[PDB]
Design a protein around this ligand. Structure first.
Ligand SMILES: CC(C)=CCC/C(C)=C/CC/C(C)=C/CSP(=O)(O)OP(=O)(O)O
Lengths: 334, 334, 334, 334, 333, 334
């Protein structure tokens, strides 16, 4: 019955309109910690997003975002973004963050800390290579996974082992990030920002904007593919991660998203539409129709069912084949 | 393999259309208890519902119902409703009732009594105040919720607290009753019955029956929204009542119906169709498209997602706009 | 890191769009055993179907199929069936059979020996009596349930009783088989195959190929319903069986296929279209809407809902009307 | 039905006084996997101590031991050790090794290859420096812990971390091996083998065999305490290792052996007996007589009890008294 | 607060020291159910025991004992056995029996019914073949296993699969009963009751009592060894039965008495004391010193450790050599 | 890691042979919170003991000990008791106290405050009534139960009820305490210390010391039994208390002592050795040989088992013969 909290949850259902629901399904003290944790990285991203802010001003701010969590009156008004309310009415968010147990604060604070540094590290440059494309996702998604993992263990609703495992807690983040990137391609383009790592989109066209050009379809799609064959390598980890979870609320919160992504990459795979406007996430076979993503055996089958939708449409003309099959063949025998 | 019991189940699937399946999938003892509990509650209901009966002859049959169960030859060939064989063949029903461990009989007992009394206490009047509305839903549904909670704690399948907290069990019942009273308005009106609370619909029109007139449809919807916003208050209880359950079997029987209800209110919210025909209740987006109501965290994600579906379709000019927002905010933060 | 085991899963998906996903979702050692069990079974079946093979040759192969399991080099190159890949590269599948623990080997080997004996036995004939239909379903489906059961128990993932009760295992087998044999009526007739128990369709028509001619659809649906009734007799066993499984992955692998079978039987029941095209498997009621088949109680509810969709469809004018209601009543009383 | 696996378990009980029981009590797969791993390691070890085998002849055997696992008929009949039956009937053991799943073979074979290389290195040499004493121990006991550890993570019975963290695994190995050496002193000396690091025992006497002489007991016990102090340093890792275990059978298999070692290091600390005959593991305090080593806390309790038994006996006049205390402290404050 | 319930537990402790503590540690309703069950069995077995009751007077008693449960005043005063307190005051026990929920009564009444018929079947004869040894061990112990299993399952504390597995449940009982019939040779001899299979001891001596004579000691141990070998075969089932359990109270209740019997056989194997007096239970070696029979892995490990003690003392000369080893070989693989 | 915290643990092991081990085994925050607690109670106790600290100086010390906790420099250098170390180095211990979460401090200080006052009240008197034996055991033992209990609940490792039900916590405390006063009759007598309630021994002899006399052994043992009987009355609470615990470290910590005390009373019951020397714990008969005190079911069993040990030895000729049976009988039927 706290004005600040209610408002916090008003921002959660506002910005993170896809997780919101499951976040509110999290058991006990995990509920707020994550809700607030989502608002702050939502706010932290808005700052990094907002392009009407100088690089030499954004950088400082980015780096200290983690310090503002203890500045009762910190705030931002000059932000001209749709999610700018989180910045404007931040004090509300910081107040509640300030009522979170110390064990949860340390983590959230610590993650904003490094996420920031990293976000700034890629504020003047582009995603160079694959090897580099992971560093970025690690900063904007990976670290989030680690943070969430540490919150679970810290809440003692999950085994201490979920926190330790970060390599996988990271893949969990990299998979989604790479997914979204690869999904809303035109959106990022029509927005003034490039994200598809170079060294790969390069070997196709000269400017990853060409892909939005009609007489490109071929090189367009093909690139998309090998970009997906890259993301699919995170499945084995995503499966291992979830296989360790022992809390139902936590399982859903982690599982659902991962499954929407696979459903996404299975729809985006070789689907030209990925450049026209938007792709609809068509579901799986007439078997995974009686299986919700709430128990591991179900999840797996659901993944496998999607891996098939892909392995099925894999064209030989594609220079990304073989590997596409080499990865899916591994997710099958694991 | 009781030729009689086999009959009882035939009747269960012959009347309790929306509960038969979950009642049958109830573990061991609750299976027969809860089944009979319905067949009798049906009887006591199919009577109040038969207008052919004179009020002089109806009132008795109600109070003296909690003791017909113990009257081997009782029946009521003098009825013209639909669920009449549950009275004309009542002995087969009463018989099986005596076959239940006295502790189960003791519950089904102290209720038919407390019900026919409250039920009788309404044969003449109509629902007036909002408060008087709960009171009615109590005698008709709230009691059922409590008696079940009694049965669940009695079988030892659930903790003793479920049947102890008569309040939560009541909300469980009221939420189901109101959602129906709301949903079945047009049908009730056409029938000749009026369950909508007078102090509410009178603030909109002269006769509760006017809402049937296509001319007053706009007012009818405003009242709908008001009543719906009322019913949304039982949710916090519902969740609480549902999270205490430990038995899968029982959980399904409880959660699904509440979920079906929540889904219903969201279907009807600000929906004129409630005054013209029948509303088709559908699921959530693609997040709740991946879950089912068999486990609490998932149930919560569904409940939370139906709320947002309501919160978005709220008109600013609607009389209850902020009342609705207030409780939906209470639900997402609590 | 074995190309032979990888290849197997490739074949597992190339030929089982119906199970590959729930098979690869199985826990620990059951995964490979069931995958390979499925492959040799599939390979055995391709032999028993390959029409371009003289009975004066096909028999011994069916009789000695079990033995080709211990022969590194055995393989069949002269096949023209769809899934002939498994026969041509059998040394790859057999190699992996020999890599499984010895207890799964003796199980798969025993079923492969018994199934071949039965298969060869029905090459030179059709299903006469209704007790031969059983015997035949036993050899192609029933033994598969026993085998699978024997393995589940052998792995200790499931109780030892699951394997011991071959009677209940058999039902599981017969129920899935009969269903397919009923749904696939048109597909079988348009292919020189007689699977319906002729001791039945002979009391409705002269030739089994007459149910095709529209002038006899009334006698057809009439025969259709008699069989669907016969098969419904297995459901109790199906329930007894699924109620024993304690491992989730295994539960999914068993319950899903079963629920699908019923959904089909409930769509094909009294449906004329059976003799014109394929039947479209609708949805799980409006109650079974929020519940999937991953837990026994739910699977119970789901099953009963379908038992109703058929009960509220039995034409009093159908000669099977009594049996049908009889059993549906038995099923729900238990 | 396998008589060779029965033979294997007979050898497990003839060769492993200490582990047969906890091994046989291992869950499912880990059972045979550990049994056979223990048996090939036994054969490798027996080939190593066999002193009637010249050194030039023995290297090729130790180097190729891992490869003979895959030579069905390989056997060694020229050994004169006592457990030489495992080598004379090695074909039976390797048979069942080849019957294990490939994922275990890869682990067991790899640990065999590296353990051979290592055993070979120390043939022509003696253990000198503590860092060398550690090296030898890694080659004979460390790698075993790593082996078992990778076997547990492969069976999915334990977390993926158990296997990945090789240092903790090696700690478990070293701790047990160091203990025997420290205890089997006399028995070794009366054999012709020296395992006590030289840089240590040397600074006490001229010949290791001198500690045997009754006129050195003072230097005997003093050295004994230095080495034990060296050993105690592994306990922090031992405790960390065991606390990540989640499977009871495996926990039993890991803890029991360790509590045994620690009980031994305790009964040996500052005990002239080590140089005259065997020391008797006299159980600890009264508090432990009601405790068993099957749960983590009790094991924490047991270890801490043994630490005190050692701490209360640390004589000031000991060259390492300030070392022994400083480490037990670190154990107590961890 | 019940005086008659209070009384029942007093009886439980007087007549069954080997189980009283684990029975009282049982969860919820299982506690009262298993207590009463033990008491009526205690009586039924006391009637069978009393050798001062004629066979023609005894047959009716065993046959109708189960109905006596429902005869409030029924009691028996002509018993001369020392456990007859429950017989003389059976109305207190029966009163608490009619107090137990029905689902429990139905199980306890059924076992008493079946055990009646069986105990009566053997008043006339002696156990001859090993096969008959099982039928007999079935009536006095196996049914107690089946009854127990069904009680656990009915209580909901244990899985439905437990009370459904009558084959393994039966084994749990045969095992315990054989270990005792074996261990209590010299005791059964001075009482005039013979429980060792005749088709077995007859291959060694003229009268089973001859094993009591010091110059047959060698033949005695050889017989003792054959029988123990026979009892060992139930261990696999026992391990399967125990593995299934999930409730701690129910586990400790089933495990401990089995481990105890295992310990007993280990101590009696190729041991002469059996024929001269009493054999005291040795305990765990090096591994067992940190393990207790309260978790399955630990249970198994102890049992393996025991199987080994026997295996190590198996003389190659004993006519049961290959069997004794063969069975231990199945138990450890 | 902190040097002071290590020092604390050194003291814990030197001043606690009965809890040092089990305490260090405790999880998370409870570890330290309980260590400090024992240390400060240990000191306060050493003050009370020390017979060279005049009443004039001792009273103020006791009453104000709890305040000495928040005073950085407070120390006591005139103790002559062996454990004096914790007093001379009190600032080190008080430093750590001040580092415990504020909530743990509230408990430790309150127990110290209450304990001091009460210890001071018994300085110039002995225990007369049994009613007074209770109030004493409370001030020195019971309050420790309340402390520990209040602490487990604060840490949230146990449910709040554990801390609330102070009566059951007091009992756990008095039982251990009373038992000790028994066992140590002679050791205390040779200390001019009298703890055996005067209103009880007064009725057998003339002076509490007359029991050391060989001719009074008869009356000696009779009194013994009465007290032992008195002690048995706490067992019901003990069982209740222990059955409420959810954490294994906390269960061990609490169970071991209780079981140890019950064994001590069984050994002492009617044993003339109480007045001639020391009585050691007889070995858990037969049924209790294979049981540790790590799970409730086993603890009850061990307890019920020791009850019979007593019950068997009760002679009709004991004045308290009847009360001893009575209480035990109550313990049996609960
Ligand atoms: C687990 C258990 C105890 C019993 C189940 C027993 C089973 C699986 C029996 C075989 C049943 C059939 C005929 C399955 C579909 S054939 P298909 O795979 O060729 O059909 P498709 O076209 O792929 O869907």
């Amino acid at each position: 019955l706290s004005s600040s909290l209610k408002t916090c949850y008003k921002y959660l259902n506002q910005t993170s309109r896809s997780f919101a629901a499951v976040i509110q399904a999290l058991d006990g003290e995990m509920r707020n910690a994550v809700c607030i944790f989502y608002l702050v990285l939502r706010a932290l991203d808005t700052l990094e997003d907002d392009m009407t802010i100088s690089v030499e001003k954004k950088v400082p701010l980015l780096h200290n975002f983690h310090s503002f969590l203890y500045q009762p009156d910190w705030r931002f008004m000059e932000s001209k973004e749709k999610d700018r309310q989180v910045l404007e009415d931040f004090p509300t968010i910081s107040l509640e963050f300030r009522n979170l147990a110390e064990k949860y604060q340390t983590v959230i604070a610590d993650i904003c800390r490094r996420m920031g540094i990293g976000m700034a590290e890629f504020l003047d440059k582009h995603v160079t290579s694959e090897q580099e494309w992971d560093k970025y996702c690690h900063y904007v998604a990976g670290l989030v996974g680690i943070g969430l993992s540490r919150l679970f263990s810290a809440s003692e609703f999950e085994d201490p082992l979920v926190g330790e495992d970060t390599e996988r807690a990271n893949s969990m983040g990299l998979f989604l990030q790479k997914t979204n990137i690869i999904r809303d391609y035109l959106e990022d383009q029509q927005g003034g920002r490039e994200f598809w790592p170079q060294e790969v989109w390069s070997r196709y066209v000269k400017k990853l904007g060409d892909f939005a050009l009609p007489e490109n379809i071929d090189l367009a799609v093909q690139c998309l593919n090998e970009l997906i064959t890259n993301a699919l390598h995170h499945i084995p980890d995503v499966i291992t991660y979830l296989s360790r979870l022992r809390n139902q609320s936590v399982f859903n919160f982690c599982a659902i998203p991962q499954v929407m992504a696979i459903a996404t990459l299975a729809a985006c795979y070789n689907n030209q539409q990925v450049f026209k406007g938007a792709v609809l996430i068509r579901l799986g076979q007439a078997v995974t129709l009686m299986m919700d993503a709430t128990n591991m055996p179900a999840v797996k089958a659901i993944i496998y069912q999607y891996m098939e939708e892909i392995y099925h449409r894999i064209p030989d003309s594609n220079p990304s084949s073989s590997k596409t099959r080499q990865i899916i063949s591994t997710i099958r025998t694991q």
